[PDB]
Design a binder for this molecule. Structure first.
Ligand code: MG
Ligand code: MG
Ligand code: MG
Ligand code: MG
Ligand code: MG
Lengths: 205, 142, 59, 94, 37, 171
RNA sequence: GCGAGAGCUAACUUCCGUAGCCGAGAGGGAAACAACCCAGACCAUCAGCUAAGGUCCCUAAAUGAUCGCUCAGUGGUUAA
RNA sequence: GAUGUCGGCUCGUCGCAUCCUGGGGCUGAAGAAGGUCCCAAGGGUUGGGCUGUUCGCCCAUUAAAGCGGCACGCGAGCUG
RNA sequence: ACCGCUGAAAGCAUCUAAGCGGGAAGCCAGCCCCAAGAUGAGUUCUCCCACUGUUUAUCAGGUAAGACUCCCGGAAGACC
């Protein structure tokens, strides 16, 4: 349901009481609302929020049209949120609250093409008792004349990372509104400067 | 020497699946699609009336709509891609119980596939008759 | 191809190849079979004739 | 059909098996089986009444067709020419 | 419960029942509780 | 075969369709049956006559009467079973209507009567499921007689007063 | 297949007797399929009657008629 | 006119006649702990010493340290 | 699997043939991720707009909205 948009910023040490706790400072800048999809307009409920600002000289005509339909001010990023609402815009103020468990979802860093050891763990082989299949290189891929082929999915080398990931249940250590800053314990996905989306715990204990 | 073809036609009949046993209704729908009483009654291409189907949701089975009637569908490389659902379980998508029980009785090659197109099922009643703006000779079962 | 059409007309009245055919048969009189389909495809006026002709030699 | 027509029409030149009576003009008469001389649908026997008169137009040698047979592994390959003769007959009958 | 292939009475009580497709045995005594399936 | 239908006063039947409707002092009831299953009131009392006879038909026969006969004793006098809480610290109390167990579980079992049934408790060791529809009542005290089945060694839990449960006997 | 031995009255097992087909045999049927079943291809034909097998739809033809049987999906993998 | 052979390693995947977890009937089931049969394969099923071993024996643990199938799975993947 | 309520055929008995309820790490939904080449190619919001070319060059040609090319880089990447 509820949720906001933001830029990851870095992690750092912070003591809450006498326990040093690592956190990820996320800037959940205010988020405008640029379109309310209704189960009677677009067939399903949801809100269109926006994020970084974009210079107007860079805005497509078609987009202006959109953004103007709600006198907003071109953002550069728009995203939806099912079953969400209110009036005006969306800022963490009153949205999230210190202590709330949340789910941060960003785009994982990108590892490019990675072998099986690093993409699936595997194990490759030896390093001395004979070879050319030193450490990496997968083993065998199938079996034989039966299923005389390979399974759809057999883990293999392939572009690793650069995916959508969602780390669940994160305590919100501290919220400094009026800076739209927010500290979540643990570690959120992707690179600093990267987009991140925080929300109510999709399904927490 | 034997007769050629037409086109300028496309009878738009409308069956009703209410209470009728899926099979019988099937055969019929299947038949009028491939070529019922048939125009030039010719193979090469289909002249088989387009068929609209209402209700569906209330077709009929006999001793099993729980037992036996298990529609199977085996996904990607069969790494446990064995999916089975109760026909009653087709309270999710009745429109398929028919759809995919009639495509069965239609030819299986190029044209045949071109043939499921004319078949057009709806699990409702009135609301269906909306997705219907041409003729509609409601030629019920028997 | 012939037998297929001959009864998609046969059944167009209330007969069906099986029956229909034995009928014209019941009337040695009738004896086309060859072109019968065509008659049933082009001349409905005619085809009916032969149709009813059989029922009228049937029951 | 199986030799010597029948049915209705309007008199066209059609080809059938050889008719024996060579020459031309050979006024030919075919019984009849069905027809509509005036949309008058007429079935067997009740049609025998009416009849058809057609004249032998010409005699022909069909289009050369090759009869080839074949079985594998056992060698066996057979090539042989062929083409069936006929008779052209201009319809005109009752 | 006893799932034997050759089910049959065991004392003047065993009420050999036939529930859903199965041939069963219900007797006051439980160790008598039989069942082909 | 079965036939004798004691359909006293208060009641009111209505073989209107397959809906063999009913109404009495306890409240108007309803109890479907087959159609081909014949039955209507002939004079004073009642009767469910049957088409064929043997099985398929006679079964449904030995079915309907008893069924209706229940609608009778129902609206007429209403049902109400009585349960027994038994064994140390076993006990029922109550919340509005909701029966409340307390039979040795780390926490307490809270029961709730279905729309048209009521619980009752005399001594917090004796239970009472009173109702209309013979079934439900049975079909609910059942759920009580499950929160705790009697043990084969001290027959604790719930039971049917003159409940016959012998002890296997241990050490 | 039928009659025997050999073999665990096992084997698309082995060895003989005897009939048929494949081998040197196309065609229809038995989903597919040497030998099973119906049948032995001189060539042509948008002609006709049948065999075995079949006549809900995928393919040709009665979702035929009458009196029954089983509710098992038996039908559409065996026994004490 | 070549279908590479034992074991290991790597990679798996499937059956169930279930090793462990889950649900049950009976027990000669007091409770705790078991036995046994029924249902159930989701996931899991350790590390070493000896031997090429597969197996098995043993150490030390474990909820458990299942049994089989896939050309006794996998050498155009390695070992040898 | 197993346990039950109402209950005949067997005026009793019966988890059953009418009917109804509970009930597993399993099935379906749920969680995270992909997803209309879901060729049955879906929905929504916004932008550009109705040009030119004589039966001799029958259609492409100026263009809008928009984008690509190219340059400089990147927490994106084998190349794209
Ligand atoms: Mg390594
Ligand atoms: Mg035997
Ligand atoms: Mg257990
Ligand atoms: Mg290999
Ligand atoms: Mg580059």
């Amino acid at each position: 349901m509820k949720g906001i948009l933001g830029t990851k910023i870095g992690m750092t040490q912070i003591w809450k009481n006498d326990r040093a706790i690592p956190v990820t400072v996320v800037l959940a800048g205010p988020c405008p609302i640029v379109q309310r999809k209704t189960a009677q307009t677009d067939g399903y409920e949801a809100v269109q929020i926006g994020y970084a600002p974009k210079a107007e000289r860079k805005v497509n005509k078609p987009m202006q049209g959109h953004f103007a339909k709600a006198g907003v001010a071109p953002t550069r990023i728009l995203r939806e949120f099912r079953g969400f609402a209110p009036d005006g815009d969306s800022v963490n103020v009153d949205i999230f609250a210190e202590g709330e468990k949340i789910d941060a979802t960003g785009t994982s860093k990108g590892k490019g093409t990675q072998g099986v050891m690093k993409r699936w763990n595997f194990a490759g082989g030896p390093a001395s008792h004979g070879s050319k299949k030193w450490h990496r290189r997968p083993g065998s891929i199938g079996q034989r004349k039966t299923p005389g082929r390979v399974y759809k999915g057999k883990r293999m080398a392939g572009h690793m990372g650069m995916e959508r990931v969602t780390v669940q249940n994160l305590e919100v250590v501290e919220i400094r509104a009026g800076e739209n800053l927010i500290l979540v314990k643990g570690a959120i996905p992707g690179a600093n400067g990267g987009l991140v989306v925080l929300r109510s715990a999709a399904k927490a204990s | 020497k034997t007769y050629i073809p037409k086109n300028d036609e496309q009878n738009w009949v409308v069956v009703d699946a209410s209470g009728v046993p899926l099979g019988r209704l099937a055969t019929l729908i299947a038949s009028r699609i491939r070529g019922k009483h048939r125009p030039d009654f010719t193979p090469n291409m289909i002249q088989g009336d387009f068929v609209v189907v209402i209700n569906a949701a209330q077709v009929a089975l006999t001793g099993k709509k729980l037992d036996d009637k298990v529609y199977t569908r085996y996904t990607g490389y069969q790494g446990g891609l064995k999916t089975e659902t109760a026909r009653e379980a087709l309270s999710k998508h009745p429109e398929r119980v028919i759809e995919h029980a009639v495509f069965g009785m239609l030819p299986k090659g190029r044209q045949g596939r071109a043939m499921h197109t004319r078949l057009k099922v709806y699990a409702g009643e009135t609301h269906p008759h909306s997705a219907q703006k041409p003729q509609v000779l409601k030629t019920q079962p028997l | 191809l012939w037998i297929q059409r001959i009864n998609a007309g046969a059944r167009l009245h209330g007969m069906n190849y099986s029956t229909f055919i034995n009928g014209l048969k019941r009337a040695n009189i009738d004896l086309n079979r060859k072109v019968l389909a065509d008659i049933a495809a082009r001349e409905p006026e005619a085809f009916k004739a032969l149709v009813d002709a059989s029922r009228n030699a049937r029951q | 059909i199986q030799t010597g027509g029948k049915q209705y029409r309007v008199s066209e030149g059609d080809v059938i098996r050889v008719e024996s009576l060579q020459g031309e003009a050979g006024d030919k008469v075919e019984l009849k089986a069905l027809f509509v001389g005036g949309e008058q649908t007429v079935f067997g026997e009740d049609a025998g009444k009416y009849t058809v008169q057609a004249e032998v137009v010409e005699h022909g040698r069909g289009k050369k067709i090759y009869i080839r047979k074949y079985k594998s592994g056992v060698q066996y390959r057979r090539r042989t020419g062929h083409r069936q003769n006929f008779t052209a007959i201009k319809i005109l009958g009752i | 419960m006893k799932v034997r292939s050759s089910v049959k009475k065991m004392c003047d009580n065993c009420k050999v029942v036939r529930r859903h497709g199965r041939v069963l045995v219900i007797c006051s005594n439980v160790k008598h509780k039989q069942r082909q399936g | 075969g079965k036939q004798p239908i004691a359909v006293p006063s208060g009641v009111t039947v209505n073989a209107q369709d397959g809906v063999f409707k009913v109404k009495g002092p306890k409240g108007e009831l309803t109890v479907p049956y087959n159609t081909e299953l014949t039955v209507r009131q002939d004079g004073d009392q009642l009767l469910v006559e049957r088409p064929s006879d043997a099985q398929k038909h006679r079964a449904l026969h030995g079915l309907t009467r008893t069924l209706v006969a229940n609608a009778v004793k129902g609206v007429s006098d209403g049902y109400t079973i009585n349960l027994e809480l038994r064994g140390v610290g076993f006990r029922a109390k109550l919340t509005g209507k909701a029966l409340e167990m307390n039979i040795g579980y780390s926490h307490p079992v809270i029961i709730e009567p279905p729309a048209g049934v009521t619980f009752a408790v005399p001594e917090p060791t004796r239970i009472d499921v009173s109702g209309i529809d013979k079934q439900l009542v049975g079909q609910v005290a059942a759920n009580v007689r499950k929160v705790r089945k009697p043990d084969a060694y001290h027959g604790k839990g719930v039971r049917f007063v003159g409940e016959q449960i012998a002890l296997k006997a241990g050490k």
